[PDB]
Design goal:
- By secondary structure, the chain is α+β, with helices and mostly antiparallel strands.
- It has a single domain (1-110), classed as Nucleic acid-binding proteins (OB fold (Dihydrolipoamide Acetyltransferase, E2P), Beta Barrel).
- It has helices spanning 9-14, 19-25, 71-76; strands at residues 34-38, 45-51, 54-60, 83-90, 98-106.
- The longest helix has 7 residues, at 19-25.
- The relative contact order is 0.24.
- It is found in: Cytoplasm.
- It comes from Escherichia coli (strain K12).
- Homodimer.
- Belongs to the class-II aminoacyl-tRNA synthetase family.
Length: 110
């Protein structure tokens, strides 16, 4: 449960089946590491983070409880210090690959 955590087998699968399903099996991949690229609109944002050697894009959506634990917590993450976060994988362009950030589990210092 790291950045764009796990799930390879996944990808093999996600790439070709139904939602319902995708869900049943669903992965809540993450974002660990650190960044700052948001597209705010007050609350629920779309974000982009970095990890060891590259980035992933997510969806920080607090559709129901329009928090700060969110993109703001994110606003707070830095350098050495690291994230452990999660979002499900969902239909961005083809039906796979982006994270739908819902739980942000921040760190300790590295």
């Amino acid at each position: 449960f790291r950045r764009d955590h796990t799930s390879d087998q996944l990808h093999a699968e996600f790439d070709g089946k139904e939602n319902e399903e995708l869900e049943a099996l669903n992965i809540e991949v993450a974002v660990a590491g650190r960044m700052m690229t948001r597209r705010i609109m007050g609350k629920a944002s779309f974000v982009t983070l970095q990890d060891v050697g590259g980035r992933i894009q997510l969806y920080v959506a607090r559709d129901d409880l329009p928090e700060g634990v969110y993109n703001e917590q994110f606003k707070k993450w830095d350098l050495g210090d690291i994230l452990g976060a999660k979002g499900k994988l969902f239909k961005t362009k083809t039906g796979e690959l982006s994270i739908h950030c819902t739980e942000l589990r921040l760190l300790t210092k590295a």
